[PDB]
Design a protein around this ligand. Sequence first.
Ligand SMILES: [Ca+2]
Ligand SMILES: [Ca+2]
Ligand SMILES: [Ca+2]
Ligand SMILES: [Ca+2]
Ligand SMILES: [Ca+2]
Ligand SMILES: [Ca+2]
Ligand SMILES: [Ca+2]
Ligand SMILES: [Ca+2]
Ligand SMILES: [Ca+2]
Ligand SMILES: [Ca+2]
Lengths: 5, 5, 629, 629
Amino acid sequence: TARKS
Amino acid sequence: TARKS
Amino acid sequence: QGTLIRVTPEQPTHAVCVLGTLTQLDICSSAPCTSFSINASPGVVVDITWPLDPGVEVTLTMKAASGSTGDQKVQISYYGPKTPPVKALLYLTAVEISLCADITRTGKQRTWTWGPCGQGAILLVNCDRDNLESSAMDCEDDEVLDSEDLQDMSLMTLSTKTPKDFFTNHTLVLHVARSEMDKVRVFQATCSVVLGPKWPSHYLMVPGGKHNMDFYVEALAFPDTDFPGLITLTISLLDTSNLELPEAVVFQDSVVFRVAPWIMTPNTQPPQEVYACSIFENEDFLKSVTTLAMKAKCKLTICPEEENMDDQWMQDEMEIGYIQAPHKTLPVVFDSPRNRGLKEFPIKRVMGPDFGYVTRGPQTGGISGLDSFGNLEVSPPVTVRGKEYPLGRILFGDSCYPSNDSRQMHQALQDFLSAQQVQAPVKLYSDWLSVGHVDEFLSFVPAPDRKGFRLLLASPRSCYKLFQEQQNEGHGEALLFEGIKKKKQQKIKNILSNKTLREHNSFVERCIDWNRELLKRELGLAESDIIDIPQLFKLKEFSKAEAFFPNMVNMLVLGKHLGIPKPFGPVINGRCCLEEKVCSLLEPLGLQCTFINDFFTYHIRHGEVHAGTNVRRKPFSFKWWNMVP
Amino acid sequence: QGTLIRVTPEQPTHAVCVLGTLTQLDICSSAPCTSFSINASPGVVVDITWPLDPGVEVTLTMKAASGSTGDQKVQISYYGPKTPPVKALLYLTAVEISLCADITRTGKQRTWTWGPCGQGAILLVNCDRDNLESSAMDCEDDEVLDSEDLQDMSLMTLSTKTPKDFFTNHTLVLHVARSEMDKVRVFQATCSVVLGPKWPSHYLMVPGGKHNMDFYVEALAFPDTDFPGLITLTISLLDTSNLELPEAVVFQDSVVFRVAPWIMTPNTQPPQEVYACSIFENEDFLKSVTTLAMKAKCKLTICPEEENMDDQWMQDEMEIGYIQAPHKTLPVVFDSPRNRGLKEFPIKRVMGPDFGYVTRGPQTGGISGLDSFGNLEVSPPVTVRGKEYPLGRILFGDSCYPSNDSRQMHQALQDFLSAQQVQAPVKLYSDWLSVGHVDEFLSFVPAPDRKGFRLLLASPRSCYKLFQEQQNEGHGEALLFEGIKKKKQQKIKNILSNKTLREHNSFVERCIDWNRELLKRELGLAESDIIDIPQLFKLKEFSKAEAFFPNMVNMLVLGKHLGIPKPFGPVINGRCCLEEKVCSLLEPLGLQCTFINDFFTYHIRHGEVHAGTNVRRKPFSFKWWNMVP
Ligand SMILES: [Ca+2]
Ligand SMILES: [Ca+2]
Ligand SMILES: [Ca+2]
Ligand SMILES: [Ca+2]
Ligand SMILES: [Ca+2]
Ligand SMILES: [Ca+2]
Ligand SMILES: [Ca+2]
Ligand SMILES: [Ca+2]
Ligand SMILES: [Ca+2]
Ligand SMILES: [Ca+2]
């Protein structure tokens, strides 16, 4: 759910 | 043996 | 397009002359005699009684198309001191054969040339979906299924003017090189395919007399590493008079098309439509952008959780650009290979009637965070040391050098952006950031003065200055993160005294400063084009940078209306001093700052207002083909 | 390469300055005061007492490298009307970091530019085999196995001048973009690899003080559709002072190399070595070319039947060109994908010490007769409407348009030749010929006048003229094919009266005339550059053209010595009138014509003297990088 991966 | 093929 | 006709007194010669070509005569080769005279019918103009010397140039020009075969004639009379005149005959048939396209770039040499004084027709990639209840882009099959589809295509016309029986003994063939046939398709109108991926040539069925035959051309591929962007279509006139001999080419002509590149729109181009997929947990965020959109007169589209799959990062899966020809301009979504929960959105919801689609990269892995289009931006129009970039300059983030642990945007993407040529990409340094996106440290906003914009950069420096100033005025006790129930408040004095936080932000400052000077060189910016936005960072996993408080530069720019993440700064005199500082910097430009609570919904998951939204903007009025890259 | 240093009265700043870069000072950002003064140590030159106004430009320049860290200093004293002077300190360490290559193109901006006034280093593809008893080209492994191999490579040197302890806290890294690392390899000399296909970056082990580090660079790929021909190598200086922070780039510099293209040599360049693989049935042919070679001072190499596999067409499996850098020029064989009996010859016999190797196309099928290098030629130097082609223009044969039955040279080959850029290929029309080669209708020979050559073209016209003239003088009974025991003689009168033969040769004339005008436009030729060689043809299988008698234009040009197939023409006054006609045309240019009996050995198998041989010629003195394509 984070912007990161 | 010809130039062609 | 020169032709040298050999005339012979042994027998009459017969030949075709296409109007607008050079026809000359070999009078000497088969001559008998010292001198020669030429007599022609009134429709033939002879430029040049003369001696029979090889270097004598004799050129024939015809004024109009023939009504009948051989209806013009030339008589070359050879003579000498004691020699009765010996005549050789030439019978001529003039025809008009012109392949026409919109080469002046308005409405309808064989070189394509850039600029306002240049020449050459434009072709659009037919990458949208005008067909009714369908899934494929229009250019994937070999039929015109909708009449409005033809609006996307380029008109080419073959005008011929010949005798009524001319194509008894001649045939026209339309062709494209086999190396280019996979990138174009052409239809004959009365629509059916004549040229394309399977078919590099077609015999045209053409009646004698005056005729006009219309073709519609679609491009099937954008410029790229393997494709400079040019398509040449050729008409050949063949002599088929002899049933026992192969066909003989007597004339060729061509038109060269350039395929229109995919062009991005910077934050300074007026917004037309705002995207969010804020149908997931939280609705007040969505309420705020909806108010901004309304304020900025934009259409608003929202992607629900059932389609999102809980992917809220509308910035990252796509970039809405455009393609532009004199007859047609349309928006076009570049779909990122990111392929997270929003994977289907560009395909199923954005592409459609008059909305095109492009994608690049591997679609099942082999990707990185720098392939998210938060890492893909463009500058406003700029002029750099006399070189003009009237559509701006694509900016995307990279590492400073390739190492085992460094990331880059996939080469396929990088290669596609460079090949579009018209927004000459610039690599910036973004890999110091955890997420890794240029939208975490820069923005552009309109301004009414100077070059019409400001570059905004995140600035630890500005924030330490701001906080030191408050402390100096007795507000050291003021709490960062006031307003947040589920967070540890921190005092201005403790933030300033924190030596590790300061070291981290000095390293970050250096990273951003590097980009500052890089943008200064590559965009021709002066300090007076640049505004620093107070912003603190912290280094975390792998010493990578993350926003200490909501990253205010990661903002939604909707003209003069700005959607800025709410930093929840120290409240001094009834107002967050960060908001106040930002306002003091931007309001003077006529910008209106709206601060949006994105804290638990976006900030906490490594992005902000820009990262959670996207925008379709107005295409530049400047026509890309008028640039000289 | 701009740097903006922020000076602060709160604490001294420390910074490195690389000589030759722009260093400026931000004096205002963190100032207290109305005015400021600057005082620097003698090794620092300050360009710019002044008011504290942001727009005041203060630039620092250092004259030489530092002996010790921070051994230069700047003191900015801030002051006001009632304010004791407040000083901020800046300690500076100057270093020299220069990455050098032969950018002036003799012997050792970061853009590569063409022409005599241009700049940029040259890199050769290391495609030869200097290694002793080996099979691989030198560039296939990652070692320098022979000292003479380094002669093929480009020298790059890193000169540094720093304090003795400088690399305690800084590190240099050498790198190449991942998109370019497969096309270059670089070795460090003391040789071992530092950069290459597996390794885009390497930490250099560099001592403080004055040091010079030598690298040798080899290219691994020629320019091509996927590779414009440029390689950039970059040195980055990294600040590694903080054990708890990532490394910080403080300086980058680059050198851009262009990879040298493969260049062909026309018939007008002096011959150095002649090839035949005339070890098969017949030795008198081989005797004649051996005499010509001896006459022209050429090395001679011959391929025996055991290696030939009865493939006598030495013209067709290869083309001997060259690559050229300021430090090194060497011949390079382009190996045709033809892959008939001569397949192994270029690999096993031609490539070797100072003889390079290139090949293109599919090697196990998917090929055509137009891929034989009898169909690959070059013009002499020419100037075309003001545009200069000082290395000539590659010529290769094609169809006039793509049909189901048409042939072309494989696109991979076509693509490679165009990407070399320096001999801008021209497509000619050769597919009307049975075999299909441009060497069946054209040749170039040196001439002492005009542009230094003549274009020779086969000419049915010239032969009918010649034969009509003999008949007119009473020789109608004269026999074509006199001298040939195993052939039906034909009389001049019967040849002339043959209406089908005449039709065939008119169609052929049209095909050659088409090429004539095409060569005229694309090479800028006038008629006076052109000589017609009397030559008859016949249409056979699929209406494709074959030589009626030995194709005299398919000749071996060894300077002024010509090896012309013996036509066995009508003998008039003790001499073949075809030979006599050819001599009358070429002897006036100082050419010597030797007529070689190739009748049963070559002619009868669809080729002649040119087709049965090849030649290595002297490279142009004109340096390719001095052209502006
Ligand atoms: Ca369609
Ligand atoms: Ca369409
Ligand atoms: Ca996607
Ligand atoms: Ca449309
Ligand atoms: Ca973006
Ligand atoms: Ca090696
Ligand atoms: Ca070598
Ligand atoms: Ca081969
Ligand atoms: Ca060598
Ligand atoms: Ca050749």
